[PDB]
Swiss-Prot record:
Zinc finger (C3H1-type): 8-37
Its biological purpose: Regulatory subunit of the poly(A)-nuclease (PAN) deadenylation complex, one of two cytoplasmic mRNA deadenylases involved in mRNA turnover. PAN specifically shortens poly(A) tails of RNA and the activity is stimulated by poly(A)-binding protein PAB1. PAN deadenylation is followed by rapid degradation of the shortened mRNA tails by the CCR4-NOT complex. Deadenylated mRNAs are then degraded by two alternative mechanisms, namely exosome-mediated 3'-5' exonucleolytic degradation, or deadenylation-dependent mRNA decaping by DCP1-DCP2 and subsequent 5'-3' exonucleolytic degradation by XRN1.
Top-level taxon of origin: Eukaryota
Subunit description: Homodimer. Forms a heterotrimer with a catalytic subunit PAN2 to form the poly(A)-nuclease (PAN) deadenylation complex. Interacts (via PAM-2 motif) with poly(A)-binding protein PAB1 (via PABC domain), conferring substrate specificity of the enzyme complex.
Stretch of the intact protein here: 1 to 41 of 679
Annotated localization: Cytoplasm
Additional free-text comment from the UniProt record: Present with 1600 molecules/cell in log phase SD medium.
Entry's family note: Belongs to the protein kinase superfamily. PAN3 family.
UniProt modification remark: Phosphorylated by the cyclin-CDK complex PCL1-PHO85.
Gene: PAN3
Recorded domain comment: The N-terminal zinc finger binds to poly(A) RNA. Contains a pseudokinase domain. The protein kinase domain is predicted to be catalytically inactive because some of the residues important for catalytic activity are substituted and it lacks the equivalent of the binding site for a peptide substrate. However, it has retained an ATP-binding site and ATP-binding is required for mRNA degradation, stimulating the activity of the PAN2 nuclease in vitro.
Protein name: PAN2-PAN3 deadenylation complex subunit PAN3
Length: 41
């Protein structure tokens, strides 16, 4: 599996958001949907 559609990263929370509650590297090529604006369940 070499092709990865954004739908994959957007379905997997980054350890940053999960552990640090923030992904300062989000601005970088860090994979996953790091959404820290729309706080939802
Ligand atoms: Zn990240």
């Amino acid at each position: 599996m070499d092709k990865i559609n954004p739908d994959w990263a957007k379905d997997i929370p980054c350890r940053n958001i999960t552990i640090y509650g923030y992904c300062k590297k989000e601005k970088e090529g860090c994979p996953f949907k790091h959404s820290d604006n729309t706080t939802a369940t």
